[PDB]
């Protein structure tokens, strides 16, 4: 049966700061001695917690049903284990799944069921004075719960539940998450001595648990516990006193921080990247400590928003199966050439098949090439013998790089040969494939000459007959099966890969996604990388042509693959930003120059906005002497750290 | 153009039409060699036929381009070894009779009725162990009076008409034509005329004299003994007891000639019938030996094609030890291996033919040989020569552990040694003099028998048991007199066989003297080996042997300083009897 608590006065929500808290083990690697930039969820420093009580006194039991954005950050200031847990769902009404996560007084249980949670949950703790003795006797979370599809229950302890009398001796701190069907928990406990707010210091917190619960997290509530007594007369909704205990709670967001690790491995600070520009010089230069001096940052900081990668909508294999498996390859000096195009190929299990020879790329790197987008791919299969294999190659030379197949320098390809000895040899000789011995001149790259003139090698007319100094230059290949390794045919596919102007037509695979605007966001178009806020564009170009580059030759138009139509790209703000410091050494103060602001675009105001005619200058105070330079401002101006 | 370079572009078409007939020529010999039945010689013959007239016809071609132009001395070597007419500037009408010449000295010698009793084993078994004294002068003299008798009047005809055929091709006599094979033109510094050759081969036997007069007196006051009272201590070794029919190989007198009786050698046969290896370990054992001398490994197909063990007597092939190089990348080894220590040797023999051919496969077609035509079996003489030192023997597990060696084995080794490779080289030397000289024509046609008697005497020590006119004919019961082959091969092997060895047991950093000196675990030898192994016959062989061993020359030296342990105890040995002999003491 649930009970709605009377009797708890009012008050208004109280708030705090963290002093560089909620730090965590972002991967399960050892490191040491050593500065790590990562990227993920993490609370910002310095940032504004809620702060919620239980304290007797006023009552106060706060419970209230909080939101989960992102991930929580959970902290709890406790001496007597009034906090007993959380349970986390949508609804919380048995129309859909919720998460319970308890300590009752000897088991810890984690339960994914449809819960009639009551609308105030709790539980309860018992002190009896004729034999002093503190027991649990209420437990008023739920009505019911049906379908259960997660279930865990620890190992029976006995917990202490006595009440303390002192100030708050222990820190609990917790993080949770919500990513891809995974919660996950990561958690340190600290000793403390302190009475209120939320402490200084640092501490990074260990992975916990991750629990596969697959549900839809968006609010949360937190289960703490009650003292009944002889000094609390009532009945079941007004009969109970609370108990003192705190905690906080704080919100993750995407943050890029950089990591220090000492020389046994563990996180002993942290610098939040974005948190002013001073980070920014810290996080670039890759240290704690700034020297003296004038740093460029960078343009106004959205953060990381959101990611998209566009491709085009194509879902037709290229025909890979074909080129290779063909019935009849060719023989070298009338090549093949088959042009693929309007397809989405995946290569990687053509790497993998581990049936070739040689797999050589020139170029290109090996694993990119798996997601990429070109213009057009040739392919160009035939036989050879196993020894002249090595000729295949830009800029080498031989009777098959000269007269029958020639390679340019820039190829942008990739070679696969292998052994085909079981296929295209017989007993007494496989005479079908033949190969030019002799020619006038070198091929360019790219060219056949299928015909049969006859070699006139020396100064006689030769009249169109052969015989002495008149020779034929097509000669045949003997294969056998009994042969060598050098004298054995391998077949030959060469790749190309070729872009133009032309809208993409080989691309894949790679599953694209929704396009955001108005946000500074992430962007792959067509395997073009950026970072940048797309805007709707009301402009046009022509039919063959797909970017737009400015002086610079930045990518500043990019047109959409799917729906064809023309995005711009602003970068995440438009302004000039620049850091002048005295030292980390010496002081943390800064001031920052605004290069492209007439004092407003600038992250605060502050007092002390003087403007030169480098910028608007925040953070420095003008004076109408005139010293040597120390530090260079820019035109004509300098600065310094006096008194 | 200009002639070398339409030369270069005639070679080019030539070279790829004669790898595949010289290929389906050898898989045609091949097939016959393993299966000995009917239909396979038609084959053989048919193969060898096509590889002929293309070669004949291919040959005429090659004539038209003068050989002054060409100047790139690669392209001259090719067009120098396919320009030569050989045998057919004679005219039509004495080809014929001098082939039948030839066929009928073959067979002549082939077939031989001593009664009845033929050579193989008939003569050769008596010969070879009978320790009769007039049993084998029986068996001595009939061949010497029926299968020398049949050929004296047809090797006149020989003489003159093989003479005639050397003149025509600018050379002076057949000799000379024998002799140019040693014979370096063009490159400065490294020349060597067919002159030189009559030279070094005298500098270096007045060299190597006293060994042999110390091992003959030995031998003859230890056969002394077993045949009482006919052998006299001034006088030679009568020619039918040196344990041969024609006295070529002392081997057979180790039976009697031991210096220490008691002591036995490294037989090892037990040791690997206990083991039971399977007649084919032994050539991974080689292999194993050369991967670690530092030579690549061996072809796959060398493992499935070759055939190591005789089929049985459901297939009959003839199988004397032999390694074919096929082309077109394709080895095979010829062996009915047995479980003995002589097949654990020829493995090794034969494995190192076989890396000798894998080197130079890079070479065109016509320069895919030995430097010289005593190269080949130098390189395949040192491995079955290091491959017998009871030291790598000791590293295999055979050949028990602790086996501590003694300096009375190394005599008895020594001494089985030398009565083999020292004891022929004054018949070779003496043979191939006596047909140079009679080639020449220094010797009238009078003074045939009068003459190789008195080179017997005088270099070899050797008296004859019986006097011998004008009419007889030693020399041409021998299988390379009468067969029309080279003998100054086997002189000239020897040499090389001893300067390799010395070269590479000085790269391996092996301390102490050279009949124990093994190679195997020394990188640097086998760098050494395959720098002269891949050129081929493409350099002179001066330059070839210059990058081994480190002269323009052959030497004797190398050889005497092997044998240096023997010598001082021969030396010491034969105080108490004679040294030398004398020319007047014939047994008749
Ligand atoms: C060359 O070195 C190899 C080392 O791989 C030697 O092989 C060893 O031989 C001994 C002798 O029986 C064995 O007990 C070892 O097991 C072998 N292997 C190793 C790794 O030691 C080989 O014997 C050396 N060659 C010679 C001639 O001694
Ligand atoms: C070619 O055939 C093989 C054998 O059936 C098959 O495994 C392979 O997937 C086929 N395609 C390619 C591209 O290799
Ligand atoms: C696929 O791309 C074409 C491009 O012309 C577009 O018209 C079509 O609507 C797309 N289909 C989708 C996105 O389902
Ligand atoms: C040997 O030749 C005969 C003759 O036809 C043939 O039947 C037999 O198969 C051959 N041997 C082998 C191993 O093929
Ligand atoms: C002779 O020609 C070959 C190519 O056929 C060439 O490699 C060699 O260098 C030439 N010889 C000289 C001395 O240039
Ligand atoms: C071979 O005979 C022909 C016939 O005239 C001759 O021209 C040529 O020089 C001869 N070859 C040699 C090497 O003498
Ligand atoms: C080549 O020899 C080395 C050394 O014994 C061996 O490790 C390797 O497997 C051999 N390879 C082949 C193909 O025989
Ligand atoms: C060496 O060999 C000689 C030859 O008879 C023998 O007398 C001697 O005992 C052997 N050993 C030594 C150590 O000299
Ligand atoms: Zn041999």
Same mark, same amino acid.
């Given at each position: 049966?649930?009970?709605?608590?009377? #009797?708890?006065?009012?008050?208004?929500?109280?708030?705090?700061?963290?002093?560089?808290?909620?730090?965590?083990?972002?991967?399960?690697?050892?490191?040491?001695?050593?500065?790590?930039?990562?990227?993920?969820?993490?609370?910002?420093?310095?940032?504004?917690?809620?702060?919620?009580?239980?304290?007797?006194?006023?009552?106060?039991?706060?419970?209230?049903?909080?939101?989960?954005?992102?991930?929580?950050?959970?902290?709890?200031?406790?001496?007597?284990?009034?906090?007993?847990?959380?349970?986390?769902?949508?609804?919380?009404?048995?129309?859909?799944?919720?998460?319970?996560?308890?300590?009752?007084?000897?088991?810890?249980?984690? &339960?994914?069921?449809?819960?009639?949670?009551?609308?105030?949950?709790?539980?309860?703790?018992?002190?009896?004075?004729?034999?002093?003795?503190?027991?649990?006797?209420?437990?008023?979370?739920?009505?019911?719960?049906?379908?259960?599809?997660?279930?865990?229950?620890?190992?029976?302890?006995?917990?202490?539940?006595?009440?303390?009398?002192?100030?708050?001796?222990?820190?609990?701190?917790?993080?949770?998450?919500?990513?891809?069907?995974?919660?996950?928990?990561?958690?340190?406990?600290?000793?403390?001595?302190?009475?209120?707010?939320?402490?200084?210091?640092?501490?990074?917190?260990?992975?916990?648990?991750?629990?596969?619960?697959?549900?839809?997290?968006?609010?949360?509530?937190?289960?703490?516990?009650?003292?009944?007594?002889?000094?609390?007369?009532?009945?079941?909704?007004?009969?109970? #006193?609370?108990?003192?205990?705190?905690?906080?709670?704080?919100?993750?967001?995407?943050?890029?921080?950089?990591? &220090?690790?000492?020389?046994?491995?563990?996180?002993?600070?942290?610098?939040?990247?974005?948190?002013?520009?001073?980070?920014?010089?810290?996080?670039?230069?890759?240290?704690?400590?700034?020297?003296?001096?004038?740093?460029?940052?960078?343009?106004?900081?959205?953060?990381?928003?959101?990611?998209?990668?566009?491709?085009?909508?194509?879902?037709?294999?290229?025909?890979?199966?074909?080129?290779?498996?063909?019935?009849?390859?060719?023989?070298?000096?009338?090549?093949?050439?088959?042009?693929?195009?309007?397809?989405?190929?995946?290569?990687?299990?053509?790497?993998?098949?581990?049936?070739?020879?040689?797999?050589?790329?020139?170029?290109?790197?090996?694993? &990119?090439?798996?997601?990429?987008?070109?213009?057009?791919?040739?392919?160009?299969?035939?036989?050879?013998?196993?020894?002249?294999?090595?000729?295949?190659?830009?800029?080498?030379?031989?009777?098959?790089?000269?007269?029958?197949?020639?390679?340019?320098?820039?190829?942008?390809?990739?070679?696969?040969?292998?052994?085909?000895?079981?296929?295209?040899?017989?007993?007494?000789?496989?005479?079908?494939?033949?190969?030019?011995?002799?020619?006038?001149?070198?091929?360019?790259?790219?060219?056949?000459?299928?015909?049969?003139?006859?070699?006139?090698?020396?100064?006689?007319?030769?009249?169109?007959?052969?015989?002495?100094?008149?020779?034929?230059?097509?000669?045949?290949?003997?294969?056998?099966?009994?042969?060598?390794?050098?004298?054995?045919?391998?077949?030959?596919?060469?790749?190309?890969?070729?872009?133009?102007?032309?809208?993409?037509?080989?691309?894949?695979?790679?599953?694209?996604?929704?396009?955001?605007?108005?946000?500074?966001?992430?962007?792959?178009?067509?395997?073009?990388?950026?970072?940048?806020?797309?805007?709707?564009?009301?402009?046009?170009?022509?039919?063959?042509?797909?970017?737009?580059?400015?002086?610079?030759?930045?990518?500043?138009?990019?047109?959409?693959?799917?729906?064809?139509?023309?995005?711009?790209?602003?970068?995440?703000?438009?302004?000039?930003?620049?850091?002048?410091?005295?030292? #980390?050494?010496?002081?943390?103060?800064?001031?920052?120059?605004?290069?492209?602001?007439?004092?407003?675009?600038?992250?605060?105001?502050?007092?002390?906005?003087?403007?030169?005619?480098?910028?608007?200058?925040?953070?420095?105070?003008?004076?109408?002497?005139?010293?040597?330079?120390?530090?260079?401002?820019?035109?004509?101006?300098?600065?310094?750290?006096?008194? | 153009?200009?002639?070398?370079?339409?030369?270069?572009?005639?070679?080019?078409?030539?070279?790829?039409?004669?790898?595949?007939?010289?290929?389906?020529?050898?898989?045609? /010999?091949?097939?016959?060699?393993?299966?000995?039945?009917?239909?396979?010689?038609?084959?053989?013959?048919?193969?060898?036929?096509?590889?002929?007239?293309?070669?004949?016809?291919?040959?005429?071609?090659?004539?038209?381009?003068?050989?002054?132009?060409?100047?790139?001395?690669?392209?001259?070597?090719?067009?120098?070894?396919?320009?030569?007419?050989?045998?057919?500037?004679?005219?039509?009408?004495?080809?014929?009779?001098?082939?039948?010449?030839?066929?009928?000295?073959?067979?002549?010698?082939?077939?031989?009725?001593?009664?009845?009793?033929?050579?193989?084993?008939?003569?050769?078994?008596?010969?070879?162990?009978?320790?009769?004294?007039?049993?084998?002068?029986?068996?001595?003299?009939?061949?010497?009076?029926?299968?020398?008798?049949?050929?004296?009047?047809?090797?006149?005809?020989?003489?003159?008409?093989?003479?005639?055929?050397?003149?025509?091709?600018?050379?002076?006599?057949?000799?000379?034509?024998?002799?140019?094979?040693?014979?370096?033109?063009?490159?400065?510094?490294?020349?060597?005329?067919?002159?030189?050759?009559?030279?070094?081969?005298?500098?270096?036997?007045?060299?190597?004299?006293?060994?042999?007069?110390?091992?003959?007196?030995?031998?003859?006051?230890?056969?002394?003994?077993?045949?009482?009272?006919?052998?006299?201590?001034?006088?030679?070794?009568?020619?039918?007891?040196?344990?041969?029919?024609?006295?070529?190989?002392?081997?057979?007198?180790?039976?009697?000639?031991?210096?220490?009786?008691?002591?036995?050698?490294?037989?090892?046969?037990?040791?690997?019938?206990?083991?039971?290896?399977?007649?084919?370990?032994?050539?991974?054992?080689?292999?194993?030996?050369?991967?670690?001398?530092?030579?690549?490994?061996?072809?796959?197909?060398?493992?499935?094609?070759?055939?190591?063990?005789?089929?049985?007597?459901?297939? +009959?092939?003839?199988?004397?030890?032999?390694?074919?190089?096929?082309? +077109?990348?394709?080895?095979?080894?010829?062996?009915?291996?047995?479980?003995?220590?002589?097949?654990?040797?020829?493995?090794?023999?034969?494995?190192?033919?076989?890396?000798?051919?894998?080197?130079?496969?890079?070479?065109?077609?016509?320069?895919?040989?030995?430097?010289?035509?005593?190269?080949?079996?130098?390189?395949?003489?040192?491995?079955?020569?290091?491959?017998?030192?009871?030291?790598?023997?000791?590293?295999?597990?055979?050949? /028990?552990?602790?086996?501590?060696?003694?300096?009375?084995?190394?005599?008895?080794?020594?001494?089985?040694?030398?009565?083999?490779?020292?004891?022929?080289?004054?018949?070779?030397?003496?043979?191939?003099?006596?047909?140079?000289?009679?080639?020449?024509?220094?010797?009238?046609?009078?003074?045939?028998?009068?003459?190789?008697?008195?080179?017997?005497?005088?270099?070899?020590?050797?008296?004859?048991?019986?006097?011998?006119?004008?009419?007889?004919?030693?020399?041409?019961?021998?299988?390379?007199?009468?067969?029309?082959?080279?003998?100054?091969?086997?002189?000239?092997?020897?040499?090389?066989?001893?300067?390799?060895?010395?070269?590479?047991?000085?790269?391996?950093?092996?301390?102490?003297?050279?009949?124990?000196?093994?190679?195997?675990?020394?990188?640097?030898?086998?760098?050494?080996?395959?720098?002269?192994?891949?050129?081929?016959?493409?350099?002179?062989?001066?330059?070839?042997?210059?990058?081994?061993?480190?002269?323009?020359?052959?030497?004797?030296?190398?050889?005497?300083?092997?044998?240096?342990?023997?010598?001082?105890?021969?030396?010491?040995?034969?105080?108490?009897?004679?040294?030398?002999?004398?020319?007047?003491?014939?047994?008749?």
């Amino acid at each position: 049966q649930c009970v709605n608590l009377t #009797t708890r006065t009012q008050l208004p929500p109280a708030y705090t700061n963290s002093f560089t808290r909620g730090v965590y083990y972002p991967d399960k690697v050892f490191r040491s001695s050593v500065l790590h930039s990562t990227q993920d969820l993490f609370l910002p420093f310095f940032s504004n917690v809620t702060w919620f009580h239980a304290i007797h006194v006023t009552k106060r039991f706060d419970n209230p049903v909080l939101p989960f954005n992102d991930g929580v950050y959970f902290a709890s200031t406790e001496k007597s284990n009034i906090i007993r847990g959380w349970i986390f769902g949508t609804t919380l009404d048995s129309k859909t799944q919720s998460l319970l996560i308890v300590n009752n007084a000897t088991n810890v249980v984690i &339960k994914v069921c449809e819960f009639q949670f009551c609308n105030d949950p709790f539980l309860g703790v018992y002190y009896h004075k004729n034999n002093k003795s503190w027991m649990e006797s209420e437990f008023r979370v739920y009505s019911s719960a049906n379908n259960c599809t997660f279930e865990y229950v620890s190992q029976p302890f006995l917990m202490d539940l006595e009440g303390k009398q002192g100030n708050f001796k222990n820190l609990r701190e917790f993080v949770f998450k919500n990513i891809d069907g995974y919660f996950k928990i990561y958690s340190k406990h600290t000793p403390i001595n302190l009475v209120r707010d939320l402490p200084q210091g640092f501490s990074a917190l260990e992975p916990l648990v991750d629990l596969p619960i697959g549900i839809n997290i968006t609010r949360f509530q937190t289960l703490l516990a009650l003292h009944r007594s002889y000094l609390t007369p009532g009945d079941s909704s007004s009969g109970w #006193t609370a108990g003192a205990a705190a905690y906080y709670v704080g919100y993750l967001q995407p943050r890029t921080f950089l990591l &220090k690790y000492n020389e046994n491995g563990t996180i002993t600070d942290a610098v939040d990247c974005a948190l002013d520009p001073l980070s920014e010089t810290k996080c670039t230069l890759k240290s704690f400590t700034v020297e003296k001096g004038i740093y460029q940052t960078s343009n106004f900081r959205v953060q990381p928003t959101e990611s998209i990668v566009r491709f085009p909508n194509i879902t037709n294999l290229c025909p890979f199966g074909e080129v290779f498996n063909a019935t009849r390859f060719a023989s070298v000096y009338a090549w093949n050439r088959k042009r693929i195009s309007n397809c989405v190929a995946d290569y990687s299990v053509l790497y993998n098949s581990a049936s070739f020879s040689t797999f050589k790329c020139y170029g290109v790197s090996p694993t &990119k090439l798996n997601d990429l987008c070109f213009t057009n791919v040739y392919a160009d299969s035939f036989v050879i013998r196993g020894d002249e294999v090595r000729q295949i190659a830009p800029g080498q030379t031989g009777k098959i790089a000269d007269y029958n197949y020639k390679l340019p320098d820039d190829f942008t390809g990739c070679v696969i040969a292998w052994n085909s000895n079981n296929l295209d040899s017989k007993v007494g000789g496989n005479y079908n494939y033949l190969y030019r011995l002799f020619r006038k001149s070198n091929l360019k790259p790219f060219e056949r000459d299928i015909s049969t003139e006859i070699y006139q090698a020396g100064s006689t007319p030769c009249n169109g007959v052969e015989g002495f100094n008149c020779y034929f230059p097509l000669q045949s290949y003997g294969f056998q099966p009994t042969n060598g390794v050098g004298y054995q045919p391998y077949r030959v596919v060469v790749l190309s890969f070729e872009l133009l102007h032309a809208p993409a037509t080989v691309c894949g695979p790679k599953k694209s996604t929704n396009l955001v605007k108005n946000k500074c966001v992430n962007f792959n178009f067509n395997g073009l990388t950026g970072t940048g806020v797309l805007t709707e564009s009301n402009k046009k170009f022509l039919p063959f042509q797909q970017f737009g580059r400015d002086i610079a030759d930045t990518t500043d138009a990019v047109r959409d693959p799917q729906t064809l139509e023309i995005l711009d790209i602003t970068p995440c703000s438009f302004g000039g930003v620049s850091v002048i410091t005295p030292g #980390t050494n010496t002081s943390n103060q800064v001031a920052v120059l605004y290069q492209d602001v007439n004092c407003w675009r600038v992250y605060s105001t502050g007092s002390n906005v003087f403007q030169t005619r480098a910028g608007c200058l925040i953070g420095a105070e003008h004076v109408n002497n005139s010293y040597e330079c120390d530090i260079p401002i820019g035109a004509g101006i300098c600065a310094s750290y006096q008194t | 153009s200009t002639i070398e370079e339409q030369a270069k572009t005639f070679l080019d078409k030539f070279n790829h039409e004669a790898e595949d007939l010289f290929y389906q020529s050898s898989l045609a /010999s091949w097939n016959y060699n393993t299966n000995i039945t009917e239909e396979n010689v038609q084959n053989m013959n048919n193969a060898g036929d096509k590889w002929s007239a293309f070669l004949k016809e291919q040959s005429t071609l090659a004539q038209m381009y003068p050989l002054q132009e060409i100047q790139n001395l690669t392209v001259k070597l090719q067009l120098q070894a396919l320009q030569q007419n050989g045998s057919s500037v004679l005219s039509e009408d004495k080809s014929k009779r001098l082939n039948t010449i030839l066929n009928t000295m073959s067979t002549i010698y082939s077939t031989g009725k001593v009664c009845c009793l033929l050579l193989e084993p008939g003569l050769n078994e008596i010969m070879a162990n009978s320790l009769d004294y007039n049993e084998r002068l029986w068996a001595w003299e009939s061949w010497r009076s029926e299968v020398g008798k049949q050929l004296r009047p047809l090797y006149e005809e020989y003489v003159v008409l093989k003479n005639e055929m050397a003149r025509a091709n600018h050379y002076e006599d057949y000799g000379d034509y024998w002799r140019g094979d040693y014979e370096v033109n063009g490159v400065d510094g490294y020349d060597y005329s067919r002159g030189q050759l009559i030279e070094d081969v005298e500098h270096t036997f007045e060299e190597i004299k006293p060994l042999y007069e110390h091992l003959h007196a030995y031998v003859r006051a230890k056969l002394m003994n077993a045949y009482p009272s006919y052998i006299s201590p001034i006088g030679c070794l009568p020619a039918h007891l040196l344990g041969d029919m024609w006295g070529r190989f002392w081997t057979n007198l180790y039976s009697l000639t031991v210096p220490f009786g008691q002591k036995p050698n490294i037989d090892v046969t037990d040791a690997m019938v206990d083991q039971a290896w399977d007649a084919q370990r032994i050539f991974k054992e080689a292999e194993k030996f050369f991967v670690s001398v530092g030579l690549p490994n061996m072809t796959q197909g060398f493992w499935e094609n070759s055939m190591l063990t005789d089929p049985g007597n459901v297939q +009959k092939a003839v199988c004397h030890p032999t390694a074919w190089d096929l082309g +077109k990348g394709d080895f095979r080894i010829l062996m009915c291996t047995k479980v003995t220590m002589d097949d654990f040797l020829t493995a090794h023999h034969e494995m190192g033919h076989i890396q000798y051919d894998m080197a130079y496969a890079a070479q065109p077609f016509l320069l895919r040989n030995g430097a010289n035509e005593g190269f080949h079996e130098a390189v395949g003489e040192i491995m079955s020569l290091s491959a017998a030192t009871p030291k790598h023997l000791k590293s295999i597990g055979l050949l /028990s552990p602790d086996f501590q060696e003694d300096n009375e084995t190394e005599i008895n080794f020594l001494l089985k040694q030398a009565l083999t490779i020292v004891g022929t080289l004054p018949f070779t030397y003496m043979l191939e003099k006596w047909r140079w000289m009679v080639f020449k024509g220094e010797i009238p046609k009078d003074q045939w028998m009068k003459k190789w008697w008195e080179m017997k005497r005088e270099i070899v020590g050797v008296v004859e048991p019986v006097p011998h006119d004008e009419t007889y004919c030693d020399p041409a019961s021998l299988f390379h007199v009468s067969n029309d082959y080279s003998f100054i091969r086997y002189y000239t092997r020897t040499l090389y066989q001893f300067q390799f060895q010395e070269a590479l047991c000085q790269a391996a950093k092996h301390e102490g003297p050279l009949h124990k000196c093994d190679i195997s675990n020394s990188t640097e030898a086998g760098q050494k080996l395959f720098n002269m192994l891949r050129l081929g016959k493409s350099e002179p062989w001066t330059l070839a042997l210059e990058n081994v061993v480190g002269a323009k020359n052959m030497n004797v030296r190398p050889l005497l300083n092997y044998f240096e342990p023997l010598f001082t105890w021969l030396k010491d040995q034969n105080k108490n009897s004679f040294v030398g002999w004398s020319t007047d003491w014939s047994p008749y």
